[PDB]
Amino acid sequence: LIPIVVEQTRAYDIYSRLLRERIVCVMGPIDDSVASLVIAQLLFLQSESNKKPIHMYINSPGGVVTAGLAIYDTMQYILNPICTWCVGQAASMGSLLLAAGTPGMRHSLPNSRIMIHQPSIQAEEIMKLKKQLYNIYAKHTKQSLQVIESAMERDRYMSPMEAQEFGILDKVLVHP
Amino acid sequence: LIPIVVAYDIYSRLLRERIVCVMGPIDDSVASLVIAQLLFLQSESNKKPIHMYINSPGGVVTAGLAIYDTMQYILNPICTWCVGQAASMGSLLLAAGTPGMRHSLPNSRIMIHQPSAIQAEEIMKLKKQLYNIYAKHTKQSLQVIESAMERDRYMSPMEAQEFGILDKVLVHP
Amino acid sequence: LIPIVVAYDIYSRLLRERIVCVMGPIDDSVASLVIAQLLFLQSESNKKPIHMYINSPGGVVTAGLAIYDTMQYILNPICTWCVGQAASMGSLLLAAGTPGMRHSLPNSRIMIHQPIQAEEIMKLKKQLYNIYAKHTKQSLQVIESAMERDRYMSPMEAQEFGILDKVLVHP
Amino acid sequence: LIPIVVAYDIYSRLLRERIVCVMGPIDDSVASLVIAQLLFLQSESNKKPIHMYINSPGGVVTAGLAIYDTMQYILNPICTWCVGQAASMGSLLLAAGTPGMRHSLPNSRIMIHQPAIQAEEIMKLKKQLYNIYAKHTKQSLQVIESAMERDRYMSPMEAQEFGILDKVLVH
Amino acid sequence: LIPIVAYDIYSRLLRERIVCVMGPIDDSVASLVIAQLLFLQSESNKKPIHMYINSPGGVVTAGLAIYDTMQYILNPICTWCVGQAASMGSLLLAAGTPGMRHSLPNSRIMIHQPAIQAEEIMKLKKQLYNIYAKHTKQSLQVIESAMERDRYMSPMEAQEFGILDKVLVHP
Amino acid sequence: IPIVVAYDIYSRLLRERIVCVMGPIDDSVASLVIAQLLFLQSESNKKPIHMYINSPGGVVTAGLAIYDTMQYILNPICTWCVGQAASMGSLLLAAGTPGMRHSLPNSRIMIHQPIQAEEIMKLKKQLYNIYAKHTKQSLQVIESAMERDRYMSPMEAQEFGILDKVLVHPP
Amino acid sequence: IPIVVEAYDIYSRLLRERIVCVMGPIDDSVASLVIAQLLFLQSESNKKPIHMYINSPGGVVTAGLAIYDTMQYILNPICTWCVGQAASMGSLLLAAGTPGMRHSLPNSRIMIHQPAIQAEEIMKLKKQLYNIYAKHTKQSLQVIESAMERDRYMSPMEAQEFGILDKVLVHP
Amino acid sequence: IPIVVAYDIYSRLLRERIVCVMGPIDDSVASLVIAQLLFLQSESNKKPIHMYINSPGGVVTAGLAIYDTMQYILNPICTWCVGQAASMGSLLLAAGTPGMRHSLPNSRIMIHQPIQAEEIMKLKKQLYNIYAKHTKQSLQVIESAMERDRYMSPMEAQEFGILDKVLVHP
Amino acid sequence: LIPIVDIYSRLLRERIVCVMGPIDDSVASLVIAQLLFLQSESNKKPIHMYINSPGGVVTAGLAIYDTMQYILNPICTWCVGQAASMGSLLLAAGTPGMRHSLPNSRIMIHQPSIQAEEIMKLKKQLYNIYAKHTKQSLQVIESAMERDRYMSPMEAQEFGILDKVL
Amino acid sequence: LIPIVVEAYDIYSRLLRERIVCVMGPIDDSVASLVIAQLLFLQSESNKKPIHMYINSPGGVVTAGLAIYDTMQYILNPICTWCVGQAASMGSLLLAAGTPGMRHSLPNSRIMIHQPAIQAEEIMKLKKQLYNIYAKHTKQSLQVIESAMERDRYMSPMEAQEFGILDKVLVH
Ligand SMILES: Cc1ccccc1CN1CCn2c1nc(=O)c1c2CCN(Cc2ccccc2)C1
Ligand SMILES: Cc1ccccc1CN1CCn2c1nc(=O)c1c2CCN(Cc2ccccc2)C1
Ligand SMILES: Cc1ccccc1CN1CCn2c1nc(=O)c1c2CCN(Cc2ccccc2)C1
Ligand SMILES: Cc1ccccc1CN1CCn2c1nc(=O)c1c2CCN(Cc2ccccc2)C1
Ligand SMILES: Cc1ccccc1CN1CCn2c1nc(=O)c1c2CCN(Cc2ccccc2)C1
């Protein structure tokens, strides 16, 4: 059951209430239906204002690569500062989106787990998709393409401090 | 669940802005909703553009043909936007946007290959319908379309632009 | 995921414009809903045309015939519109639209082939033959020979055969 | 996905016109709904006719008899209407409409054949259907009984000659 | 879909003090029927309540919970059997206010009973004998002997047996 | 199944003219029992055959197939009820050669019986005739008794004429 | 399946005594086994009779016709025996036994009613059944078709009066 | 199932007059056990028969079929509880020849027992009477004990009269 | 379950090969293994192919077809019950004058409901094989395969699908 | 059910006695295990006598197909490969891996080299080994193998012969 709250100018489900404050949730696996809901919200928040930051809450184990790339491209497309926030975990495509927040604006809570490994179409197309991920990670972490490729080979998570050192995020905060 | 904004679930909100979502697998039920919104949009104004957002793996040929024919029937300019992917019938609808208003975001993947109860001769008839639709809109010859469509591969947005599937690969407003 | 406009669900909105949707397989509950809408529309105006959008692979025969009979029963002209496909009972309903008001989009596919005891099945099948014969103006023997071939017709061939009157591209 | 019309869902709209739908199989939950509608409609006027649309392959016999008894109980004239088909208990409810107010559209199929209890209880129910059919068709028990053995359908005209319906309406 | 009249139809019948027991009895049904009974009693402790029963029976303890609520409320309760009232359903029918227990003409009535120990099964069965004996005024030997026989009673037989008071055709 | 000296133990019992009827009776049980009975008769149309019955009943026509085979062969057939013989199981038990129908002390026997209606009743009437014949009781008494959903103890089954002997030890 | 001595399974043992069991629903693999046995039994002797035990609710029509055609084909007289029931295709095989050698036990039930192909093909199959039933029962095609419309069974004795079988056998 | 050198191990135990009643009792188990009991009597009506019981119980009428068969054959029957004898399993254990009813030291024994009402009661009273006969407890005590959802140790069962010896070593 | 005399191996010892039921890869490799063993026993005496099949996998069928062509033995085909789709191709594929049907069988050359082009390539293989063995034209074969209908054995004889209606 | 024959022998075991190895289904670890065991066994019986390998397969697990391939290359015997019905994906690799001049197809077979829980990198590695294996045995260049394997299509037996997948197409 989604709780209902009231705003002062009607009842909103709590999620719609958070979208009213420019929070966009990316919890759970990323698939085509999640991507279209997230894209619709991002486009709608840009239209409400192309200056005001947008907050993206990420607690995701990854999901469909093309669905995550649609979200990422839409993030790059809008003009707004996008603050990304990792709670719980940001694994595979979820960490790509985390790393894709605006520079200086990528955050994790203290106990989150970050993974850029992609846990286990034609062979040549899987490798093309994978190289697309290498290029995106290189761009946003500032790591080498050869560092990104080697790191992604490793089946392991990063602490928030390591992800900060790696260049996936900027701040690990505890309180406001 | 679907958030509500300003009144409106957010998909209906984008519909009020002349955006029509073609996400996921195309089947008959997707076709009748798209056709429904396309026709309703043409009745709000036959001059204003309509935006078709496409992130689709393909689906039922006849359902896709039905959205195609509706796109060709309405007079409105139709801007097609490829986000994520447009494969099989998805890319036919992308290619079927108004000349010069067919776009892709930079990381999308576009496939014109068709990944593998009617008779053999009717499966061919449908296929030839697609060949001819692709040639009409990509301005490529049938020789190239039939040859290209045999290959189980994706195009990048720039190869797709060069082929005639779309006109613009854009990054920012 | 059915959107809202102005505040109707798009389908109700189309019904307000006198469009009745027959997409998908035809079963008893489709027929009930289609019949409900036709009667309601006739009650709104018995002369204003009614638009019937058909994109159907067919379905239950007696449910098809219930729709067919309700079409012949109401007074309104009915414009039938094939998008995608009209196969089996789908093409029977398309053929049954008011004469000269039967349409197809350019890329639709039309099939009159059909993909209780024996006697009763033949009985239904002959009911079909006769309805087709009436609406296409083809001889029973032609209809019967045509329905044995497992093939679709192009819209222009369907026009030729007498299933529809116009194959249009634009308004 | 039930259309709204103006505000009402279309079945409620029709119920407001004193139409009651009996489409699909008959079971206890269908009989409950049908009975509640007949009873409410009588409450609104015990004189205004009630239209029962029937497109049913039959169903539970005791659920059918519950509807039957409610029909016979309310004072309103009840016009029955066979669209598509009325088989087993469907045809019993059809025949049960007010004399002279039982109709069929031209292409419907009517069947009185019936395609957890003891053998004597099954016969005792069967015999109630003989009596009910004999009453409403004016045929003798031996004829009813002899016909109900035949796994076959009746055309609207045969059904009318038999006493099941009164009128075969084209439009 | 349940039709609307500002009211779904069942709620409409509840406003007229009708309570439907129209399927298998379980805890969920019992909870709903009890809630409706208590509510109707709070609207008026003198106005009759109508209990509609078309049920094959169900969970004994759940049937007994409804029974106890019928006895607890002061209101007259008219019980009406349509279709059937078997096992616990015929217990509730027999538990209507004396003189106010009805059946439509073609219903059938069964007092036969088509994890807990043997002794407990038997205690519940004896509770059923006692309750039937009270409301039918038959002896415990007669109740028990009758419930062994797997058979249905006609409305008339059920009247002679003390299960109901009136078998009626029309109002 | 164990091997004994080499045979599986049921085949070993088959060589001693023992045929087992354990479990529900269906057509494959019937074909297997019939095959064994016919084979045993061919080994000797005089030596007794022992039929061990522990069964809740089963398909009526399959049960009648065993019955007819039993009546067909010339051998004396000793029937032995261990555990239970219910419905068709107790028919076969009763159809043993007169003087040679047996039960163990704690078995339970039931003659109650837990296609179109006329056909279910034709089968039931056939069961009535067979039970009267082999219990040597009037058909009126069988028919009344079979309505009662209950078991008999071996002594009661003996008094009723279903069997001849209740044995504890080899007497 | 129990084993019997002079040592194998009871059903094969019956086969050696020229009995062929049609004891369940008829489908293609049952038709295949039956035909195999029939053709085998003719090889062992083309004159000795063959016993076909039928207890069957029917089954696939073309599978039943395969068995029928094999019965008319082989030279041996074929004695059909109904135990339990013979409905739809089961009764057609019953009635197709050699004239004077079609039996039932007393309490059998016999039914000729028939409780992805086009309508036309289903009718053609139905007419084939009429022709075969008319043949072996000596009844008129008009009467056979009237009979098959009725959802009912016949006692062994009325199946005899009808022409489906020749003897209602109590004991030997 | 391993073959030894009567070659599969279960059949080999049958040659030494052992009958296995392991697992739930249903009609098919009853039929096999009865067949072996009858077969063993035919080999000899004097040589003891050993019945190994490790059962949670099962279908009551199937259990009474085995019980009647044990009471029918003339052999001494030694019953042996390993693991557990619950519900019908403990009836069979208690039905061994007086003096020859055994348990292993860690077995658990339950006489509790985890159609129309009257018929269910009838079956229960048959159980009461069988237990009273072989345990020599009163029907009063038996019926009370069968209400309690509990197991007994082998010694408690011996003192109850369900068995005669709690065996440790041969 | 299968009687012992098993009844299938027995019929194999007399050069009968059963193609009853749907044709898939497993059926194909059994039939082929039996055709090759049968030819190996003698490349001269005939082989009987018993056929009651609704069809099956086209490449499984063609594998059987190609092995029938390959072996030198004559092949009597017999249709009991039905030979539809691939089944009727194997029927027509027996030695000319050695193709039979029993009187009530049903025969169907219609194919009741990989890339589109590969579907059509297979379909044209069938047109050609049918044209060969029936001595009909590719045009009539194609118009015939379009109709969803069965042929009586007598029609299948007229058509060239078989020779003798025993 | 697998016919038996006297030479006793289920008909597959009979074929194996004549040095025929069947590979006539989807290829997986279990099939590969059987095929390798038979190949090794046939070699032990005679490391000169040719071995016949029948192929009617839609492909299967790559690593299982490569295990069969490596075994073919390891045994010294000549390996005649025969394609009936179809050899697709890994099946066509084994077909092309028979001894030069001893790769055959029946006239109506269909041949496909197209490939209808591991990382992107490892899938590329496997596809590379298939390019190399196909290049070696067809004699085509790596470029030609790669672009031909991208096309979702079947070759006829003559196309496959001229492509270098097989040596002979024969009717009888
Ligand atoms: C969206 C919206 C919602 C409520 C009110 C106003 C608006 C403003 N509109 C109207 C139309 N439109 C708007 N904004 C937008 O960004 C876009 C459109 C149309 C197309 N397009 C391309 C695109 C870019 C990236 C992902 C996918 C598609 C972006
Ligand atoms: C649809 C609508 C919705 C809200 C308000 C006004 C309207 C205007 N109407 C009314 C009727 N009608 C309208 N427009 C349309 O385009 C069409 C119709 C009717 C029929 N027809 C054929 C067609 C064409 C292509 C795809 C399938 C069918 C198109
Ligand atoms: C339907 C309606 C809905 C909203 C407002 C007014 C109305 C007008 N009414 C009221 C009752 N009635 C109306 N029209 C109609 O055509 C019909 C009826 C009743 C019966 N009947 C027979 C029939 C014909 C063919 C298919 C099945 C049944 C047609
Ligand atoms: C029903 C209704 C609904 C909205 C407004 C007013 C009313 C009028 N009331 C009130 C109570 N009552 C009414 N009518 C009726 O026919 C009946 C009742 C009560 C009982 N009873 C017996 C019965 C007959 C046949 C089937 C089952 C039960 C019929
Ligand atoms: C229930 C109600 C509903 C709407 C408005 C007013 C009321 C009046 N109240 C309030 C509390 N209460 C009422 N009536 C009642 O009969 C009862 C109660 C409370 C408890 N109790 C015992 C009981 C008896 C038998 C079945 C189960 C429980 C009966």
Ligand SMILES: Cc1ccccc1CN1CCn2c1nc(=O)c1c2CCN(Cc2ccccc2)C1
């Ligand atoms: C059966 C058998 C088995 C092993 C050795 C010899 C035999 C002897 N045969 C051979 C054929 N036959 C024999 N006995 C028999 O009783 C019967 C037959 C044939 C037919 N028939 C009618 C029948 C009666 C009742 C149930 C069903 C059918 C009885």
Ligand SMILES: Cc1ccccc1CN1CCn2c1nc(=O)c1c2CCN(Cc2ccccc2)C1
């Ligand atoms: C069958 C058999 C088994 C073991 C030993 C010898 C034999 C005798 N053979 C050998 C081959 N053959 C024999 N008999 C036969 O009737 C037939 C054949 C071959 C073909 N054919 C046509 C046919 C007719 C109707 C249904 C299907 C097929 C009948």
Ligand SMILES: Cc1ccccc1CN1CCn2c1nc(=O)c1c2CCN(Cc2ccccc2)C1
């Ligand atoms: C069983 C056997 C096996 C191999 C060799 C010889 C024998 C001896 N026979 C032959 C037949 N028969 C034998 N013994 C027996 O105790 C019994 C029989 C027959 C019947 N009957 C009644 C019974 C008792 C209790 C449970 C169920 C049935 C006991």
Ligand SMILES: Cc1ccccc1CN1CCn2c1nc(=O)c1c2CCN(Cc2ccccc2)C1
């Ligand atoms: C088969 C057999 C079985 C038992 C004993 C001896 C033999 C004779 N051999 C030995 C090997 N071999 C034999 N015959 C044959 O026809 C064939 C072979 C080997 C290969 N080959 C090609 C082929 C043809 C068509 C379908 C598929 C493959 C035919």
Ligand SMILES: Cc1ccccc1CN1CCn2c1nc(=O)c1c2CCN(Cc2ccccc2)C1
């Ligand atoms: C196999 C066999 C079977 C029956 C009789 C004699 C033999 C001969 N042996 C005995 C052991 N051995 C034999 N042959 C062989 O080729 C091989 C071995 C052992 C190991 N090895 C490596 C290998 C090669 C390729 C695939 C996997 C493993 C090959």
